[PDB]
Write a protein that binds this ligand. Structure first.
Ligand SMILES: COc1c(C)cnc(CSc2nc3ccc4ncccc4c3[nH]2)c1C
Ligand SMILES: [Mg+2]
Ligand SMILES: [Zn+2]
Length: 313
């Protein structure tokens, strides 16, 4: 009960900032997550014995893929922590409990392949879940881990609070399907501009939570330039392995996944920042003004990718 996690001074300070990198020491990541839960939620939100056993089971069910790994889970959870901390009063006790857990779990048992590759391969998951294939799997795996003996971190919630939190996590994880982001943001953009956006409207909260999940999932583009650049190597390492597997099925991959078209990475990063990243953090900043540092970091990284093209790096 009286057992806090404490971090070294530099981590204690930097963890509060949006651009924090969780570092290369894997054994510290569980403590960093527990720390974020305690400060975001309370030392009482979860039984520490059960949380610690949940965290270690979730870690075990992430695979050794270049990008969609345990480090990504904790990175995405930290970005959600930074959003929740800078927006204290806008979120309920259940939402703060649910969203950190959702982020940690959002990519459980990822194999390093897109929903498209699963469909073209005719993977069994593509028969079980026709849309948002991996995201439905990620939620399935989250529920399975919650049902292991001694892993139910939500046991002290009423039957209805339990159903509400599982429904927050499910929508949260489905929302990380980027195919769903474009529509969700257009709708949020229209509602904000015509003044109809209402945070007591549950269907509106869902949309806002969806956008927070996309913002946290993409937070690679909001770090300091060297973190951003080095994470892009991991992202492409997965994409180019998928492109290799497309070629093996006799299908030309899209250029993003073709290692033969490495040279076009800088131009492709420009399209992505302009088409996805900047619009994402712009709509989020309009809805939650204290998330502006993410939009500012994202614009800085757009400018760095423009310098790569112009041969200055
Ligand atoms: C996970 O989301 C991302 C993040 C965070 C960062 N960077 C990316 C990659 S964006 C991207 N879009 C394109 C389009 C064409 C390309 N042609 C050749 C080489 C790279 C390309 C590319 N990269 C994603 C998808
Ligand atoms: Mg995912
Ligand atoms: Zn993710």
């Amino acid at each position: 009960g009286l057992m806090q996690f404490t971090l070294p001074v530099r981590l204690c300070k930097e963890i509060e900032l949006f651009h924090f990198d969780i570092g290369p020491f894997e054994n510290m990541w569980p403590g960093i997550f527990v720390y974020m839960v305690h400060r975001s939620c309370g030392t009482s939100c979860f039984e520490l014995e059960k949380l610690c056993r949940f965290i270690m089971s979730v870690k075990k069910n992430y695979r050794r893929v270049p990008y969609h790994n345990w480090k990504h889970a904790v990175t995405v959870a930290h970005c959600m922590y930074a959003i929740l901390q800078n927006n204290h009063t806008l979120f309920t006790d259940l939402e703060r409990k649910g969203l950190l857990i959702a982020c940690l779990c959002h990519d459980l048992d990822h194999r390093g392949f897109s929903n498209s590759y699963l469909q073209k391969f005719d993977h069994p998951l593509a028969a079980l879940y026709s849309t948002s294939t991996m995201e439905q799997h990620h939620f399935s795996q989250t529920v399975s881990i919650l049902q292991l003996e001694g892993h139910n971190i939500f046991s002290t919630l009423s039957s209805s609070e339990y159903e509400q939190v599982l429904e927050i996590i499910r929508k949260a994880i489905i929302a990380t399907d980027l195919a769903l982001y474009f529509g969700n943001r257009k709708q949020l953009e229209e509602m904000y501009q015509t003044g109809s956006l209402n945070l007591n409207n549950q269907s509106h909260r869902d949309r806002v939570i969806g956008l927070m999940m996309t913002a946290c999932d993409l937070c690679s583009v909001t770090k300091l330039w060297p973190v951003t650049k080095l994470t892009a190597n991991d992202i492409y390492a997965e994409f180019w392995a998928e492109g290799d597997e497309m070629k093996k099925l006799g299908i030309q991959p899209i250029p993003m996944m073709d290692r033969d078209k490495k040279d076009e990475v800088p131009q492709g990063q420009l399209g992505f920042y302009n088409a996805v990243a900047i619009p994402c953090y712009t709509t989020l900043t309009q809805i939650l003004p204290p998330t502006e540092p993410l939009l500012k970091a994202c614009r800085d990284n757009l400018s760095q990718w423009e310098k790569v093209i112009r041969g200055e790096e």
